[PDB]
Design a protein around this ligand. Sequence first.
Ligand SMILES: [K+]
Ligand SMILES: [K+]
Ligand SMILES: [K+]
Ligand SMILES: [Mg+2]
Ligand SMILES: [Mg+2]
Ligand SMILES: [Mg+2]
Ligand SMILES: [Mg+2]
Ligand SMILES: [Mg+2]
Ligand SMILES: [Mg+2]
Ligand SMILES: [Mg+2]
Ligand SMILES: [Mg+2]
Lengths: 375, 375, 381, 372
Amino acid sequence: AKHLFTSESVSEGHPDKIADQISDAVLDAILEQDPKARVACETYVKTGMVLVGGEITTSAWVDIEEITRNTVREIGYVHSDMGFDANSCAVLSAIGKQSPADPLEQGAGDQGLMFGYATNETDVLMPAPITYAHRLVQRQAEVRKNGTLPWLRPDAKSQVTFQYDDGKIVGIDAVVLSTQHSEEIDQKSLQEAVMEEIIKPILPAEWLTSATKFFINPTGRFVIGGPMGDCGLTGRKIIVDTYGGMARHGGGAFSGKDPSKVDRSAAYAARYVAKNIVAAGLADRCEIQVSYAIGVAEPTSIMVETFGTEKVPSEQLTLLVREFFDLRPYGLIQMLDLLHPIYKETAAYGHFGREHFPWEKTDKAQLLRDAAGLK
Amino acid sequence: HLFTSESVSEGHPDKIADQISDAVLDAILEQDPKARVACETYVKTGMVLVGGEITTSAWVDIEEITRNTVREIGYVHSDMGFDANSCAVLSAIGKQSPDRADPLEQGAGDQGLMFGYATNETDVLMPAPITYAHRLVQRQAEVRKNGTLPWLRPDAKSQVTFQYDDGKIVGIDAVVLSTQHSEEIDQKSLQEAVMEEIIKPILPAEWLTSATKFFINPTGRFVIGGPMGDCGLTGRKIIVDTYGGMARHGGGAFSGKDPSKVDRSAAYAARYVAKNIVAAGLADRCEIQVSYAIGVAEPTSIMVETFGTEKVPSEQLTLLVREFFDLRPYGLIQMLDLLHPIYKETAAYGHFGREHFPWEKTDKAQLLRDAAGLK
Amino acid sequence: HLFTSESVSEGHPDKIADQISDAVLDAILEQDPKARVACETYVKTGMVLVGGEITTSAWVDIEEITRNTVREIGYVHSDMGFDANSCAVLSAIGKQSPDINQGVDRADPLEQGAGDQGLMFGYATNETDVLMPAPITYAHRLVQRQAEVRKNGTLPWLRPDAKSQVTFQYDDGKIVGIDAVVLSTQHSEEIDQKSLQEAVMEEIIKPILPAEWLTSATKFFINPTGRFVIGGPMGDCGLTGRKIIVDTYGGMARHGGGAFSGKDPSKVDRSAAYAARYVAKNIVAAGLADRCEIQVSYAIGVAEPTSIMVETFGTEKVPSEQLTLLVREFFDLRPYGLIQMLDLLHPIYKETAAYGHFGREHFPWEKTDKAQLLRDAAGLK
Amino acid sequence: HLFTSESVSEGHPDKIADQISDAVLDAILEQDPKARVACETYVKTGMVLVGGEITTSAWVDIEEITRNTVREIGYVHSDMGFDANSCAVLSAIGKQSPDDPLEQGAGDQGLMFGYATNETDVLMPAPITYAHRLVQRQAEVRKNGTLPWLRPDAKSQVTFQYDDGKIVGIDAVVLSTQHSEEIDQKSLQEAVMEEIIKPILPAEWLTSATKFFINPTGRFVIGGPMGDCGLTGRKIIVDTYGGMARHGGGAFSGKDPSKVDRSAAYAARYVAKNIVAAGLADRCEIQVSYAIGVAEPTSIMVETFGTEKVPSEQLTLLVREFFDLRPYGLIQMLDLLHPIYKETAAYGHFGREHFPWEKTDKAQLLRDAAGL
Ligand SMILES: [K+]
Ligand SMILES: [K+]
Ligand SMILES: [K+]
Ligand SMILES: [Mg+2]
Ligand SMILES: [Mg+2]
Ligand SMILES: [Mg+2]
Ligand SMILES: [Mg+2]
Ligand SMILES: [Mg+2]
Ligand SMILES: [Mg+2]
Ligand SMILES: [Mg+2]
Ligand SMILES: [Mg+2]
């Protein structure tokens, strides 16, 4: 049936995403020294200040203030004219610290479930709305940092409404792009530049018609942004972090958490499964639901929803997942080789659909395709 | 096979933050129903930080509201981990003082996407797992406060796992209930009281079988809780707040936001739309997506999904939605009569399924059914 | 012998905190003159924390008062190290309902007991015409002159943070001259040190220090560490009540330990030091001593001071036994008697929080309206 | 006639702050004796904020130091108003990496006072000395189980009467102490008199005239940071001489010894104490003047209040000969680069005769070098 579907993303300068990146920068700095550390780092940013809090158990010694200032500086807040300055904002630490047979048989601590999702409607096997929303704010940051549009400032949001028909994309119905900018540029010039340097190189021409609506800084000037007059907190962008609303989400933020937190690592594993099923050609689109029982390691149930797109029977998919992936809480950590400082890169522009992340590798695809008996 | 949802009591640190954010909201709306409020709370060992931005004529004492909220939750002694009377309360709220000929045509305050959902698998038209998860922790607080089990303490968590078959409920596979308690209670007595006074009054006997597992405090003594050794933030329970994983989410938090914020009010309106479609008998379950562009009053998209359970063509449903509901941002407010101090009640035990909330009324169901030509 | 006193401008981080604390006090007293206020401020890079306890009916916006105060001091850009418009302001003030004890707990409010124990000193000397020690007097005037030329457009490139030191040479108890002068001032990036030193010399130092006391031997040090572009709370920390000697007599006289700023007049740490200055100054203006130091002390809950002591360093012109009598006769040093004697229940305290609480003769504790009564009572003509 | 000084116990909120500031200093100095430290603490209902600036190679856990300090002081329960185990601890310390030194000139036109008098055995003014001993005794009988219902927060004040520089008696004593709910005021007053006041104050100074104000406003159950702020550097007269000597300004706690405000003040005490211990005077205020860029003090005034046993100008020359008062020389003279400062942050920096600036090891040298 014909319908619209919308997703959004936000730049690395958005205050919630600032907090995510600081949490994962702290996490990465600890993991570099202590790969087995327990970290639950929650950040709060607002006018003039960063508060980094939470709980860690580690042998690592890290300078929270330096990590914080370096992270905000890299994002681009370096002057009070932008609303925020990495060099002169307040940084407060409130982190409680503590000192540090078959480990893979560790059972789950909760009744829980995890969702994964993939679809061959894009090259990265992600839903088109979240993919192109991500790409729009990532492009905003790129042309900001490389000097193409030097008047851009870090804070930006995007939103894309796709039209579907019979489950395939027909085009883009509406685009929102709001970006922070310096005082000197006028809105008409800004809108033309955003169209030419951000929107047009990112969105396929075939999907843009004369009916497409473009809302580029629709309320006009956007000089002050980031944390200034606007709070950011770790874990308040969990839908832009994942699938943009296209898939179900069981709850649980990612950033600031070490891989032992099932909320993060099991979600990564569930994406890994779904992406490899679709890359194998076993379905065009796939939502996986992994259920865990308190005190047992293997998932208690694995449901593979294929939305009628399956190329083999649905029971065969469940069995293939049982055979080729280790979805035990600690086994998936080993499968994905997660005990490394790789998380700051995940904390803006999406945890899924990205290049080099281990849960985005399609290295079980051909094995699954063979095992299911097709070519 | 299996589906699990969880809930947390008013004493969970994330929910403490939601309740403080909405108590501030309600205190302001009592004096100034048109106030703009964006209140974000951070709680952890010994402290509450209440931050954000308000535009109002109201005069409120944030510290008093905060201590009162924590006192009502029940944290009143350091032995519990947290004490309303002696914790630190910091305020970082920026205050400003207070556009269309027809206020119904006011543009949205932000972009974003919002989902609503309804299913006839329970009488309140909610998914069963989140419904009974909520009622368990709600019942823990009720018997804690009314004197029945006075040795209970505020922090608690529930998990209910349902078994499905042919898409219908077959029974409850597992129930977890963890509750905080005073040092004098032994676990055996605790488990028996919880089972007698909390679980059995709440879960339907028809869904309890020989295969149903019960886990009461599976990790033993639970004496300190809440913010102690932990950290709670507003808007980190958005799946608990809504449908428990059964339906999708647009990502926006609810608590601390006045009804001009479409993250909250349009999610309420999408629940109202979906619930009225299911109550009309036009679908067995229905999910609504809406989205907005900042400065634009008409939604950038409306999508209705009925999972093949629709009783009239999907195209007719979308038309009925556009005919009978005003989803413009200020249309939402007037449709649901939202400018009242009603929001602290929503900040624990779920925003949906409690049928005295305005977005829970099924007062358009008969109109829809009549317009659809159904008898 | 030599004697040095120092002062700091309104832009020094400790004084920023004193000023915010008294700006909050004044805004409250504007609405509720009987309010109880104990406001303590902490400033450091990027943030202000305003804490304490108030009992008042007033409704004030702590964050707005704080940003306005910082903006007036002049911190408005990250280039300076601190920006009123974008720093963080955290409020941690606990509020209580009344605004004293409703109807006071004494039939005669003059008989109310002290709110705390403690000791307080006051001092006066006829070394200067405002009856203050010279070194702190000229130290204050230097940094006050810095802020004046910065704000009135004379030297717009100055920035808020600044510090002065003045060393006087004494001989036989008399001023012979100024031995050394130190003046460090924050400035914008484009001014070079040589233009800065000459500008400070011509516009700040020479207009303020008496030419008679400056000689070929007087040493002048303008920005002895050179470049001074970032300052204030940046890379530093300011706290209410950490400048209690610059607030009073610059080391020339003793101190009882209590801070002034952020305290309403029911706090004897503040009001009894003001009253002791008023006593000592009226004794010296009366010609009863060339210099005079007063100590008072209180017990919490007790209205009569636990001790009054009058020290005149051998300069008294009548027997000291008579002086102590005159003090008991002409001044009401009970806690609330202090308030009524000096008319303290008014929003006048933010002006005291930089450039010194004493020597500025429009303040009520600087009036010498008892001097002639004292002289007449002592039998002097 | 009368002179009054006060002191406060280790549980008073300002002294809690001083103690946390110097506990952080001590932990840094144990790993890095040359560290630069300027640690400012703010304490209030439910929270400790530890702020400031350090340059050091040391790695310390600010939260653990803070909780350990508050626990030892005795705040361990919300009933007392404050709990080491569950209060908030926030850190905001800026950290820099490490980057003839005895000829270092002063950085400021400075003045430093030191004082001593033989009116007590520790060569301190009597009002501050006995004020300290009262609150220190309060803490001792709280901690050793003698009066276990005492709680940490207490203040003392003592008014002495003088005749011609000599003590004649004590006129007034204030002792206010926090306590548990269950004890009545009458029993508290009797217990405080018998166990705190009478063992500390010499009986020959107490008469029928002496006024005793013991918890004069009654119940004192809530205390410490609860409902009233504590900040580092807000007890600088308690820390020094109780108001008897002049003070040029500048707090001690949280500052490493390279801060002249602290170490030059210690050096001035050391000089004054030895002069009196040598018998060159009975009481003695020393005023040390520094010029910027100059190491040796540019002026040393030795005020003796007419009690000198030797020509007053000899005293200055004896000080020059026997003491190294250059800014970094005095640090060597007093051997200051050691973690000794948390103990100084309650009950006074002067008067306790194990600290280095309280040794009278130059008294015999000064006495021999003079006529005596
Ligand atoms: K957490
Ligand atoms: K400092
Ligand atoms: K205070
Ligand atoms: Mg947000
Ligand atoms: Mg969770
Ligand atoms: Mg949480
Ligand atoms: Mg939002
Ligand atoms: Mg200072
Ligand atoms: Mg000072
Ligand atoms: Mg005081
Ligand atoms: Mg104090």
